């Protein structure tokens, strides 16, 4: 799109539910200098969504994106 | 199980600009994503440039960015500016240098 050429972001809160795994295309990690930790998931529809990296599903999904 | 069950996905990311050393500051005090809107906490540092302001910036060059604080979803200017930069995800990725 390319999603890698969109601006960096920070998260203030996180999605409330587990996103279906086959719907996730990529991920980005927000800066450690952001006020809170954050993983951004990019869905197949090009939506960027904040997620909490302390959550198990989040790490699993990050890992499975190789 | 926590917090919303089946409403909108939410988790609107806030676009940031960074200073030379990478410290980020949001460019809008409110973000919309699908049916959701989120406001940054009152008192948060912000640049009053907007998401479209940021998307207009050439990546990785310095701009003078007006600084404010958020108040009820709006960035209220102070009398100060900070040099800020648009970075994209590409600028943060992979590892093409190493040392032996
Ligand atoms: Ni090089
Ligand atoms: Ni070498």
Residue numbers in the entry:
A (entry chain B): 2 to 67
B (entry chain A): 1 to 100
Article passage:
Anti-chemokine activity has been described in the extracts of tick salivary glands, and we have recently described the cloning and characterization of such chemokine binding proteins from a tick salivary gland cDNA library, which we have named Evasins. Evasin-1 is a small 94-amino acid protein which binds CCL3/MIP-1α and CCL4/MIP-1β with very high affinity (0.16 and 0.81 nM, respectively), and also displays lower affinity binding (3.2 nM) to a closely related member of the CC chemokine family, CCL18/ PARC. This chemokine-binding protein does not share any relevant sequence or structural homology to any other known proteins, notably the viral chemokine-binding proteins, and moreover, is considerably smaller, being only 10 kDa compared to the viral proteins which range in size between 30–40 kDa. The Evasin-1 secondary structure is composed of seven beta strands forming three anti-parallel beta sheets, one short alpha helix, and contains four disulfide bridges.
